[PDB]
Amino acid sequence: MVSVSPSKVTLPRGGSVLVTCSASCDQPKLLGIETPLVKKELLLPGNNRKVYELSNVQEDSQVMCYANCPDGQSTAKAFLTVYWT
Partner 1 sequence: MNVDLVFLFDGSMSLQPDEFQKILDFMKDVMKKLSNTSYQFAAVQFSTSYKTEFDFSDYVKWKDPDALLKHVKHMLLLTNTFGAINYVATEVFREELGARPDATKVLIIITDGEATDSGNIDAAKDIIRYIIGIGKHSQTKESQETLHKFASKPASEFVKILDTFEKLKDLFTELQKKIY
Binding residues vs partner 1 (CB under 8 A) = 29-30, 32, 34-36, 38-39, 62, 64, 66, 68, 73, 75
CB nearer to partner 1: pick between 49 and 85: 49
- Closest distance of CB 7 from partner 1, Å: 17
Strand ranges, E, within 1-85:
2-5, 8-12, 15-23, 30-34, 39-41, 49-57, 61-68, 73-83
CB nearer to partner 1: pick between 9 and 21: 21
From CA 53, how far away is CA 41, in angstroms rounded? 6
- Closest distance of CB 38 from partner 1, Å: 6
Q: Letter for the amino acid at 15?
A: G
